[PDB]
Symmetry: C3
Subunit: 274 residues, 3 copies
């Protein structure tokens, strides 16, 4: 019943403006600098959406240099209640095949260079000390809709998974890939952290459609990851994320989020000492 | 017999000037910038002490932004032989209950943004390349006095423990919390590193009174950590750290430290190539 | 048959200009700043070499402050086909004794402060987004020649090993040392990452002669590492790295590298989106 507005952050090979009807481009500024690119405002059926290319529409910005703060701030300022993203990733598990979707529910941070809070003491818009809880980083209700929708579409989709986010831009060594497996990581990328953290500070329902593109390099005997391999797999499978977003978003718009959003707002508010 | 002077760095909820008699405020400057707040000079029985609030007296400075270099430099310059600190922490072990003290003896670094040496090539006050040993990061003699004193006070106190120090300011994910358990971490915080490292470079006997405030989030079925929960536990248990400091410090002042301090000075001196 | 030119980066205690005949000093500038010190141009038998002291010839630059980008860029610009380095390290395995050489084949990154790519968006000389593969970070053909040569010299030499590279400049805690063992690390240093990563981006055959100098601190009951201990072990064993380089380099110059170099060039080229 109450209004939703869905932010969509498109990842590698997975950032297609044609998903939205009635599109208008809008460049914005934020207190944390410029977002990766213009916001694309539009609709999926009756639902207002805001699309943003994580790496810029020409994929010019490497993961370490993405302005996660500006991206999330921009989407919050536009009125987004939800941020649903796409992310390419490596599979660290035999059962997660290239082309599979994983509706991730946890992460392990391996990043090093990245601001992870709006509350850095330098911005009048975000005053105080903020310690956000990360026990449940992703919105379970949004994830549930994604999982059910993937099933209705007949897609190979894993209902949970732990993403290890590496700094990059290099891929992992084999020793690192083996190690991440022992830590219980299921998939590997370069962008989930701090995007998920900042969304939680913003009181936004965040979920991630991870698409496996390769098996990283933990099969010593088999093909290891490369840029060409990742891009080829995405070319083959991008349609699945598009269909999943197109079908999921109207279902989100048809249910009631006020309580979910209130609880997230309170968790965020009570994490700050002003 | 020989003179000691005890630096006290107060952590979250645990930075109370009333612990000292004959108090005088003194703001100082250092070659690494300003300390978190004024030094509070005073006494516990006959022993000279110097108190400093890690996060500022109004808790305005998040862990990533604490000027660990300036804090330790300021205390060294004031003549501190010892630095005994308090730190709130999460428990990663069932037997470490909220309200328990842990006299930690090891750490695992998960920080990323932090200068860990005075010897960065930029300061004429700290010339050369310094590689400090960290096999035994905390002073065992100071820890021993803390442990015995806690026993005399009847406090629930663990005689050792490994602190994992995360960058923050977010709390850990559940996947991270589980992972740290597999690494052998016992408690979790955001401030031990690089404070302990810089104290060792300074040739100061350093020890830490860690106070468990929560169980982080590794019980999937139970209450996870939040700011409100941490602050509530500290309100309930702060008196214990205060009593432990009040009772420990006179005992430190009543024994002989010249040899201990000489050995630390030599370890620090011989870590530097000028 | 086709020409090779060997860059040599000398590590701690292991950066000796006397290894080259017909020496000439050449200071250079790069788009990433100045290298650690002058390039020393010279020969080993008929083979052109370029020597560079990682830490400066007076060991004035700590690992975190080494300009890995400028060093690798400088060697590439001088025409190096190969970069063979020396690195002191701690042993995390009983069978790797101090004085042993380890021809490492993998790494685990524990660094936090370091640029790991030339492609940072800020340099016109390195345009685009680059994601370099790290499955096999070290050149197996160069490693093979090192291993066979060490055998011909009768040296204690391990044919593979995983290096964990820590940020430093502090040494590891005991809890960290134990943890790295569980991760499958064999040796520990502060310099392999990002040196190896940048060499791969440059399309250079990179290999590392690691020399164990200590057992870090994982024997709770035995001597732990210190600067004095490291430097003493290197004084005793430096001749071995020198002899290994002197004997290996002519063998490299006597075989054909065009295909190996072509494959590395293509891997690097196809990692970049322009
Ligand atoms: C150059 C260029 C265009 C991008 C080519 S593929 C690299 C992107 C895909 N993205 C996710 C990813 C897929 N497979 C991975 C892997 N195996 N490790 C880490 N990240 C990934 C990382 C990076 O942003
Ligand atoms: C906002 C505000 C005031 C501080 C509220 S609690 C957060 C502080 C407590 N401190 C220690 C701590 C307690 N429980 C923890 C946990 N579970 N993980 C990491 N650190 C902690 C971290 C941070 O400096
Ligand atoms: C001060 C000074 C001169 C250097 C003294 S020894 C420290 C260098 C040796 N280098 C390698 C190393 C040897 N043993 C190690 C250990 N146990 N841990 C990490 N690194 C090392 C680290 C650093 O660059
Ligand atoms: Cl780590």
């Amino acid at each position: 019943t109450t209004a939703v507005k869905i932010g969509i952050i498109g990842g590698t090979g997975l950032d297609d403006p044609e998903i939205l009807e009635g599109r208008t481009e809008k460049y914005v500024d934020t207190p944390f600098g410029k977002p990766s690119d213009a916001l694309i405002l539009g609709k999926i059926k009756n639902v207002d959406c805001v699309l943003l290319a994580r790496h810029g529409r020409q994929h010019t910005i490497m993961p370490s240099k993405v302005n996660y703060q500006a991206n999330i701030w921009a989407l919050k300022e536009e009125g987004c209640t939800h941020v649903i993203v796409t992310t390419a990733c490596g599979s660290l598990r035999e059962e997660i095949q290239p082309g599979d979707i994983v509706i991730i529910d946890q992460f392990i941070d391996r990043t090093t260079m990245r601001p992870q809070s709006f509350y850095d003491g330098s911005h009048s818009c975000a005053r105080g000390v903020c310690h956000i809880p990360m026990a449940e980083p992703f919105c379970p209700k949004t994830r549930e809709v994604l999982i059910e929708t993937a099933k209705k579409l007949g897609l190979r989709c894993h209902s949970k998974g732990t993403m290890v986010t590496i700094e990059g831009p290099r891929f992992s060594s084999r020793a690192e890939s083996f190690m991440f497996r022992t830590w219980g990581a299921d998939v590997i990328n370069m962008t989930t952290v701090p995007e998920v953290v900042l969304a939680k500070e913003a009181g936004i329902c965040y979920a991630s459609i991870a698409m496996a593109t390769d098996y990283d390099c933990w099969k010593e005997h088999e093909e290891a990851v490369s840029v060409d391999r990742v891009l080829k797999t995405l070319k083959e499978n991008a349609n699945k994320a598009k269909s999943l977003l197109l079908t999921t978003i109207p279902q989100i718009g048809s249910t009631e989020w006020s309580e979910t959003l209130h609880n997230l707002k309170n968790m965020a508010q009570f994490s700050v000492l002003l």
